[PDB]
Design a protein around this ligand. Sequence first.
Ligand SMILES: CNC(=O)c1ccc(S(N)(=O)=O)cc1
Length: 165
Amino acid sequence: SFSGYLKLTDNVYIKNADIVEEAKKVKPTVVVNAANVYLKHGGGVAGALNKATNNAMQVESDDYIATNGPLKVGGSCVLSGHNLAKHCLHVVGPNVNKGEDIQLLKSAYENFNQHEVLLAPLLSAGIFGADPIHSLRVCVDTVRTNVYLAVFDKNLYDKLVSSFL
Ligand SMILES: CNC(=O)c1ccc(S(N)(=O)=O)cc1
């Protein structure tokens, strides 16, 4: 199962790791993708996860969007996990750099409650523009299921652990 995680709360764990390498190693039931409403996995965690699937995630995602239309900000969809996980839970956190509402971050984390265990990044962190400290606080106060957070940046991981309340 998951190794080397630091326990933050009863159900939230954190590790300084590349979520792609973590998914390839664990092959969890669910890997969370930091998705946008269009499932266009061009960069960030989405681009990295999609690149690890040899673009199979993008091909599947385009067929999903062609059939269903875009997701809502704060929403999600379950697609294949390809070579990374059984499933990929594509969750759309608000992108502050695209001027989206940061109040939707709690709704985005509520999607995690539909899965008993998940490997996930911090929603809306990184290129999505939100404060990762705020994202971790929303995560621990919203997610009740077992969430194993992978934080790519070592320096951010240390800041997140050292400032955790
Ligand atoms: C392999 N990982 C990445 O390329 C990666 C990791 C983290 C980010 S973030 N969420 O923007 O800080 C983007 C991309």
